[PDB]
Ligand binder design. Structure first.
Ligand SMILES: Cc1c(C(=O)NCCN[C@H]2[C@@H]3C[C@H]4C[C@@H](C3)C[C@@H]2C4)nn(-c2ccc(F)cc2F)c1-c1ccc(Cl)cc1
Length: 734
């Protein structure tokens, strides 16, 4: 119930044996880090679709019975070097034999190149389109070998360098696997750059906060240990479910913000409570009780605000949820245990060994004083600004992944766009119409015919032959499928890629000719199904978030109208950050400065942004109001309580904001637009929340609601808040 005896026992226990704990924890965390140093080679770059949807099963049926298509795994554009034509029998033979021998070398992971160069004297109609009219450019296609996406990607990774050098390295590779490889390489480069350009800045700001080196060095060590432990735990959980590759940067971000932050707070409180001549044991006990309590409560708040992501079916969000939970929980545990143990074994030597306040507190006090003299004069402008900064939410369109997630001067994107400009029409996204047999094991003919007749009523579908006789054409059947007489797929493509959903639902509503059943599982179908599922299950997640955070905040300090204020402030900062992000990434303003390209936002990212911004925003309020009510408890009036709370929380919240902002800024400079999106989200939320919200709105709304801030009704207040955790004002003894 009370849990305070538990924290006191934990304190005296940690000091009772403060070598076993540090030993076992450092050993376990280093072992986990060494074991997780191979988290790669096990992260699947897959999962963006509702795995229970209809279109996913459609595509599965299709590529199982017909065999997955490999004509677009890798394409290669070739040009004759000596400014000649493409026929050029000599150069033709040279390139041909080179490709033949390089296929002979790695024959296991290359099914075999095909293209116009193979028998160039052919008269085939479509094969005669792999050459440019001026006979200057040609291209080929190389189908890789594999049974799943990761196998094919690894095969491409191992065959890349041997293929990049052909007829003088003028070959230009494009397709799908180059894009995937470039994205993963971008994630790796992000890790490297963020580490190397965020360790020194964090070290500098830390040393500037404290004034010594050892105290400024402990949080860096615990942050490294937290990163190692989180990587270990993720590698361990990988064997039970696929872990999306987007969980390596999240861990490095949340293990340099949160862990460093917690360590800073704990060491600060210890250095403060040791200034009273206390013995190291009592100092450790007091720090453990108070600061460990607030840190554990912050960790529980973050976990219970990042759990609701488990409602969505996208396999991309569950990995992020597991990463956040694991890293936050391990950071809290490492913080309390190892910090207490290291402080115990160190004691008073945490001030020397590194040699060679009034103005700040006075500033914050003068600030809160001059802003409390009139509430409305500081509550009207900020509120109208943050309610008129939410209007960009009207232009909110979403989409999928393309090659426009890279800087427009990248190598691979330019090659892909060049290939799409030279050779048009060879990049299509059809809408399959797979039909499965209910009755009639062989799907007799003219059934496909009446189904085509049925489907030809929908408009908006392309027709290159300009004739309905060649519309909704069957797809090619590779020699890797079963080719059953029961399933036979037809397909065709549309013209306006944006209005897909309308035609998709119309097709879904069409009545099949007989007991056989229809499906529409194309790629725009996949994307539209993902969008529809996310927007269908978002409101329940929002309500669960609100209820969880409000209820969990009530139990920390009995008051009904404080959770309301916290929820309002969180909703306003969330809406404001969302509006700024939309105006920045969809309206396009500020693009040429940050080197990206305007485009619709990512599909399963509006969930992550919400479930993170709400978390941190309700985390700061939980801390501030906690200090405030601790001050209020004994005999101090409202305004004095607000003043002392803000004065105390000032420097620590500033240091926290600086650490988190420095790490987020070190991540801003990424290439993959999703990283930039998340980083700008975090930075905007952090600054706009902390500075403006806190020190120009919280005192104002508190005073306007003055002295009616604990109205909480007697019955529930007593029976629940008292029978449990409690108020436990810390008693000071001799
Ligand atoms: C969540 C969260 C919090 C948070 O909620 N942090 C609370 C700040 N610590 C508070 C406690 C300890 C002390 C005292 C109280 C309680 C007040 C402060 C200071 N930060 N990040 C964060 C991490 C790295 C950055 F580069 C920037 C950040 F924003 C996250 C976060 C963001 C994205 C993702 Cl994918 C995962 C995590």
């Amino acid at each position: 119930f009370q849990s305070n005896a538990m924290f006191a026992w934990w304190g005296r226990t940690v000091y009772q044996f403060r070598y076993i704990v540090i030993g076992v924890m450092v050993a376990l965390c280093l072992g986990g880090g060494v074991y997780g140093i191979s988290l790669g080679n096990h992260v699947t770059q897959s999962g963006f679709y509702d795995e229970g949807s209809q279109s996913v099963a459609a595509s599965l049926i299709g590529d199982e019975v017909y065999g997955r298509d490999r004509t677009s795994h890798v394409v290669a554009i070739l040009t004759p070097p000596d400014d000649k034509k493409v026929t050029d029998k000599a150069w033709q033979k040279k390139v041909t034999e080179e490709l033949d021998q390089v296929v002979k070398d790695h024959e296991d992971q290359i099914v075999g190149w095909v293209g116009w160069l193979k028998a160039p004297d052919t008269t085939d109609p479509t094969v005669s389109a792999m050459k440019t009219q001026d006979l200057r450019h040609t291209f080929i296609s190389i189908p890789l070998q594999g049974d799943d996406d990761d196998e094919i990607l690894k095969n491409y990774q191992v065959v890349e360098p041997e293929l990049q050098q052909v007829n003088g390295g003028d070959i230009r590779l494009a397709g799908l696997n180059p894009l995937a490889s470039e994205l993963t390489g971008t994630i790796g480069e992000d890790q490297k750059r963020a580490e190397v350009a965020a360790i020194p800045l964090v070290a500098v700001v830390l040393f500037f906060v404290f004034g010594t080196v050892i105290a400024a060095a402990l949080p860096a060590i615990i942050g490294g240990l937290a990163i190692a432990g989180a990587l270990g735990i993720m590698r361990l959980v990988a064997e039970f479910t696929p872990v999306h590759f987007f969980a390596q940067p999240v861990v490095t971000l949340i293990g340099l913000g949160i862990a460093i932050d917690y360590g800073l707070f704990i060491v600060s409180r210890f250095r403060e409570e040791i200034a009273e001549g206390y013995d190291t044991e009592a100092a450790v006990r007091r720090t453990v009780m108070t600061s460990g309590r607030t840190v554990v409560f912050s960790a529980v708040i973050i976990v219970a605000s990042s759990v609701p992501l488990l409602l969505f079916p996208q396999g991309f969000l569950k990995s992020i949820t597991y990463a956040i939970i694991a890293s936050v929980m391990l950071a809290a545990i490492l913080s309390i245990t190892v910090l207490a143990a290291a402080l115990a074994i160190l004691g008073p030597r945490v001030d020397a060994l590194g040699v060679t306040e009034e103005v700040e507190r006075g500033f914050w006090g003068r600030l809160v004083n001059v802003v409390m003299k009139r509430p409305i004069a500081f509550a009207a402008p900020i509120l109208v600004v943050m309610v008129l900064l939410i209007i960009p939410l009207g232009q909110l369109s979403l989409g999928g992944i393309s090659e426009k997630y890279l800087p427009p001067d990248n190598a691979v994107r330019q090659s892909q766009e060049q290939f799409d400009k030279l050779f048009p029409g060879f990049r299509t996204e059809p809408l399959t119409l797979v039909m499965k047999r209910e009755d009639g094991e062989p799907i007799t003919d003219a059934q496909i015919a009446d189904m085509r007749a049925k489907a030809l009523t929908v408009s908006g579908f392309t027709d290159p032959d300009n004739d309905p006789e060649k519309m909704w054409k069957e797809r090619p059947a590779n020699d890797s499928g079963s080719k059953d007489p029961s399933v036979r797929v037809i397909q065709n493509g549309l013209e306006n890629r944006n209005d897909a959903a309308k035609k998709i639902d119309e097709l879904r509503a069409l009545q099949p000719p007989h007991g056989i059943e229809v499906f529409v599982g194309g790629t725009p179908a996949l994307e539209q199904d993902s969008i529809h599922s996310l927007f269908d299950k978002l409101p329940l997640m929002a309500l669960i978030l609100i209820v969880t955070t409000t209820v969990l905040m009530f139990l920390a300090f009995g008051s009904v109208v404080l959770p309301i204020k916290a929820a309002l402030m969180s909703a306003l900062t969330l809406g404001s950050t969302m509006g700024i992000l939309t105006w920045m990434f969809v309206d396009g303003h500020g693009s040429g400065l940050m080197n990206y390209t305007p485009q619709p936002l990512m599909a399963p990212m509006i969930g992550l942004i919400i479930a993170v911004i709400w978390g941190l925003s309700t985390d700061y309020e939980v801390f501030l109001v906690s200090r405030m009510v601790e001050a209020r408890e004994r005999g101090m009036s409202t305004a004095e309580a607000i003043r002392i709370g803000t004065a105390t929380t000032g420097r620590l919240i500033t240091g926290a904001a600086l650490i988190l902002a420095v790490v987020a800024g070190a991540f801003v400079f990424s290439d993959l637009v999703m990283m930039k999106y998340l980083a700008f989200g975090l930075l905007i939320a952090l600054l706009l929340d902390a500075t403006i919200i806190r020190m120009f709105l919280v005192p104002a709304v508190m005073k306007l609601l003055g002295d009616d801030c604990w109205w909480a009704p007697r019955w529930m207040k007593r029976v629940q808040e008292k029978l449990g955790l409690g108020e436990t004002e810390l008693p000071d003894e001799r």
